[PDB]
Design an enzyme around this catalytic site. Structure first.
Site, PDB file in Angstrom:
ATOM      1  N   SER A  97      39.033  25.515  75.778  1.00 52.34           N
ATOM      2  CA  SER A  97      37.764  26.038  75.295  1.00 52.34           C
ATOM      3  C   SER A  97      37.574  27.526  75.567  1.00 52.34           C
ATOM      4  O   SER A  97      36.570  28.098  75.123  1.00 52.34           O
ATOM      5  CB  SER A  97      36.624  25.212  75.901  1.00 52.34           C
ATOM      6  OG  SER A  97      36.871  23.809  75.780  1.00 52.34           O
ATOM      7  N   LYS A 105      28.368  32.456  77.818  1.00 54.01           N
ATOM      8  CA  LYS A 105      28.192  31.176  77.153  1.00 54.01           C
ATOM      9  C   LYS A 105      26.862  30.563  77.581  1.00 54.01           C
ATOM     10  O   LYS A 105      26.411  30.738  78.714  1.00 54.01           O
ATOM     11  CB  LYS A 105      29.368  30.259  77.512  1.00 54.01           C
ATOM     12  CG  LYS A 105      29.550  29.004  76.676  1.00 54.01           C
ATOM     13  CD  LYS A 105      30.972  28.466  76.884  1.00 54.01           C
ATOM     14  CE  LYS A 105      31.214  27.147  76.157  1.00 54.01           C
ATOM     15  NZ  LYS A 105      32.431  26.469  76.675  1.00 54.01           N
ATOM     16  N   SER A 119      35.586  25.319  72.967  1.00 52.05           N
ATOM     17  CA  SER A 119      34.129  25.232  72.958  1.00 52.05           C
ATOM     18  C   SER A 119      33.363  26.569  73.048  1.00 52.05           C
ATOM     19  O   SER A 119      32.205  26.648  72.649  1.00 52.05           O
ATOM     20  CB  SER A 119      33.699  24.327  74.114  1.00 52.05           C
ATOM     21  OG  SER A 119      32.314  24.418  74.362  1.00 52.05           O
TER      22      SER A 119
END
Lengths: 551, 551
Positions: free
Chosen positions: B248, B149, B224
């Site tokens: 997330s 990420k 997320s």
């Protein structure tokens, strides 16, 4: 809270104690000889909570002279050994209760360490434990009473942590750790004193007066678990439970020459205790046992953790209590943080323990240097009272005076904005991460990490009243949340512990502590303790190393 | 922070991506057949971050058609099986890198899941790993690339969590978890997209545009960690690292039909990640892997924890990653919280999994009821944004618009006074204690605790854009900090998953979600996932049960 005048409330606190003292004497059932000697003992209890009495020079010597063989043969016994007699029925649960109740009464008068006796519920606990002997014989703490700090909830009692305004705060439940210990055959029999705000390394409050050291009545018991240190230093309790957010378990244990474990946060349940700043999580207190007996400290941890307390308290980690299999050890000696040097008695304790470890083949012993110890005060300066001490000061709406020691703890407190707390939480986590790297820098070429560090608990043995003006030797490990076990080494020796000559102080605060150590006679017979520090969750390594140091 | 106008800053983000896309294509070395088909794929990347393109209806179908067998024979292989080929040298580290780089480029165009490729550093990692084949052959992840990420620090990159104002926040270090993986033979090769504020269960930002689902291009990837869910749903990465503070990690994993582990807080290091509200500790995020392969999830957890990450990150507990010994299991089925009922596809997945566990002799299956799920929204509503969203809103000084989903997350945020935080910390800890008691109320007469709960991840399969207006099915377990493993079950079936007829909504929000589910055709080919919930630190039980459910 309450808003009555504080003098009336101090009376109400004294009445509760005196009411429980009366019931305790009935339970203890003094014969006339003891009742006579008890009546003639010098008291650390005054006529009011601001009158500190006239304590004995050696409260422990007076205790051993005053109590009969009928009592001392039980209370002087190592609790692990006493558990054998309770199991084999050579002694009754009620018999043990009666002896320890009598001991705590004598200890209460000599050191002022008892806030409230619990003889009614204790007799019920002990009586049914005798009745249930055949079914509860197997429990690991069968028949053993223990003491609890006043801040620890007990059914039907006020929980005040020394603040008079909370005398109407009654709980209908026990603390989780208490119920667990009861589930394992133990029961509380006395509540020990705690000081105002809890944030002093001494034990003065307007609920009880002043608690004094068990070995020298002119010195403090320590704090905040001052009653626990004094009561268990007098060996008038098998063990007790305290709390430690700034040294409040290790300082009493060290001042009274016994063992005290600041256990790693997340092992044993403590959150249901009461303190100031409830809901504050930036720096969390921990609990842990104090005892004359190392074996008793180990057994309480083992008993509580094997009860799987994470199934009642979800903040806790399911990590077994396991004796380490290490055969070799790497140990560091923390001689000084180079901000406040230790007094001679502590300095000799470090050499004694150093020479003993070097004499055993399996210990590698290295010097341990500090890492930015000034940052401990700076960060704890912002996070101990993160509301600017608003919550504590509201306790003084009764007119309750602000003690001199409490003044130090709340002076400079900021009411942090959320961003201010975030800033200091990041400072807190960075220091912890930096310090770990410091600790690991001592790993050897083969990759053996430091197993433990040996350090002072305080720059001196038990302090003179209102002089505990330096916390770092204990609060360092609250900022880091490392497990720390205070343990005995030696006592002041008037020949060996004369003041340092040609001493050059490091700064104004170091000069203050140097002048505080005017001569060893001012601290006659005061225990010189040290502590073992380990990385997080290595509590058991500390117990095992302490075991070797006492053999 | 930066305060330039956001349109140029989005420009700088696009160039950074486009420059890395150019380099990735050079590294992948397309044949002309792939270059032609790649050029003609429908793109979810627009000309600017506000133009969302026109995604393919079934991006995974287009992906499998577009790529040659020379790539898919590697990227479709289970990563644990691929590790055997890398170890036995049937395939080189560089061969695997080129293939997965190509896969990620095709996945980037179809789903918009890639923020920045890392082909320069990836080629150096793969080349020297090939050169060091003999000495590094033994490492548990030798030769395996992985995705990270964008919020995860990597050497020389900006770390923005999607906020254009942080494009000048460049780090010179990797996240601890990244360095641990590199030390065990892995290396990152691509950075995946994340949304504004990180607080939406979708993946839209002004750094990348809109990320779409790997199975249906009309639906969200989730968030997320939307890039991670999309990239790993397309099997264009062996695994990825996301973050989870409100679902997330599990929402992307569930929406894209793969595995996702919200690991228990304190097992693997995550604090050096970047997000909003740095220093906020009242509710903490966790990290964990996303992958098509359960075996790859388990191997990553085993690898990181066996590196003893508590020796660099002191917030972690030294609790080994150990497969459970359990031969019998007790498992609860959480069919609904009775606030928002799950849609037909999720309800069918629950039946499939219930009947599968019942057909095995060693599972006892009980219905699991909610415990005050409304309290989840209340408490997290106060603690997610403890500063009244001041820190996030300051990111919009560039003029960056506030997205609709971000609006929901910050609506009602109070700038809490210290006493207000204390109040809600107590509400948080009380709820955790109350919930644990609820969980333990399912213990049977013999004392066997519930081993795990099976629950939805979301009231439905992958949502329509801007409709993720209910969080509790994931945020429940962030408030409690329970480990949760998202896992695959089934896909939407248009015959079986028709809307409920004569449905009576439970409330206005439930009506909204019922009307959102107009017919299965709106969610064609959407994976229906569920999750396994465990008590704190029982992560491994979740892996073992998911193993049984997939066999």
């Amino acid at each position: 809270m309450l808003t009555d005048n504080w003098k009336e409330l101090a009376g109400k606190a004294q009445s509760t104690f005196q009411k429980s003292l009366k019931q305790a004497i009935e339970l203890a059932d003094f014969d006339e000889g003891l009742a006579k000697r008890y009546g003639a003992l010098p008291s650390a209890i005054g006529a009011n909570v601001e009158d500190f009495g006239s304590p004995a020079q050696f409260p422990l010597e007076e205790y051993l002279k005053a109590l009969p063989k009928k009592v001392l043969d039980i209370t002087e016994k190592d609790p692990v050994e006493l558990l054998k007699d309770l199991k084999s029925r050579k002694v009754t649960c009620v018999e043990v209760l009666k002896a320890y109740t009598a001991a705590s009464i004598v200890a209460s008068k000599l050191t002022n360490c008892v806030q409230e006796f619990l003889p009614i519920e204790a007799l019920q606990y002990a009586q049914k434990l005798d009745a249930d002997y055949e079914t509860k014989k197997h429990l690991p703490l069968y028949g053993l009473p223990f003491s609890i700090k006043e801040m620890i909830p007990f059914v039907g009692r006020s929980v005040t942590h020394g603040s008079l305004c909370y005398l109407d705060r009654i709980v209908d439940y026990n603390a989780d750790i208490v119920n667990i210990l009861i589930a394992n055959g133990a029961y509380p029999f006395v509540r020990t004193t705690n000081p105002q705000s809890l944030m002093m390394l001494e034990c003065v409050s307007f609920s009880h007066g002043r608690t004094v050291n068990a070995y020298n009545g002119m010195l403090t018991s320590g704090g905040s678990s001052g009653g626990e240190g004094a009561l268990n230093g007098m060996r008038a309790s098998p063990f007790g439970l305290g709390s430690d957010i700034g040294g409040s378990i290790r300082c009493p244990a060290a001042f009274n020459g016994i063992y005290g474990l600041r256990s790693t946060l997340g092992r044993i349940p403590t959150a249901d205790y009461f303190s100031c700043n409830r809901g504050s999580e930036s720096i969390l207190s921990v609990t842990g046992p104090l005892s004359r007996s190392l074996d008793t400290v180990n057994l309480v941890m083992k008993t509580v953790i094997e009860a799987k307390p994470w199934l009642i308290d979800p903040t806790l980690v399911p990590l077994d209590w396991k004796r380490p299999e290490n055969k070799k050890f790497r140990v560091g000696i923390y001689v000084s943080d180079h901000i406040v040097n230790p007094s001679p008695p502590i300095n000799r304790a470090l050499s004694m323990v150093t020479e003993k470890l070097k004499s055993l083949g399996n210990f590698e012993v290295v010097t341990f240097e500090p890492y930015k110890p000034e940052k401990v005060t700076e960060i704890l300066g912002k996070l101990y009272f993160e509301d600017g001490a608003r919550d504590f000061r509201a306790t003084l709406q009764t007119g309750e005076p602000l003690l001199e020691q409490t003044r130090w703890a709340i002076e400079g407190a900021e009411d942090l904005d959320m961003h201010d707390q975030w800033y200091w939480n990041l400072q807190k986590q960075a220091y912890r991460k930096e310090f770990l790297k410091h600790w690991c820098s001592y790993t050897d070429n083969d990759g053996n990490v430091l197993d433990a560090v040996i350090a002072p608990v305080f720059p001196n043995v038990a302090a003179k009243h209102e002089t505990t003006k330096y916390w770092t030797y204990t609060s360092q490990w609250n900022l880091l949340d490392y497990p720390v076990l205070a343990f005995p080494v030696t006592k002041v020796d008037e020949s060996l512990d004369q003041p340092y000559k040609n001493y050059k102080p490091l700064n104004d605060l170091d000069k203050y502590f140097y002048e505080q150590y005017d001569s060893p006679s001012s601290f006659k017979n005061a225990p010189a303790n040290l502590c073992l520090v380990g990385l997080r969750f290595t509590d058991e390594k500390l117990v095992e190393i302490a075991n070797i140091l006492r053999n």
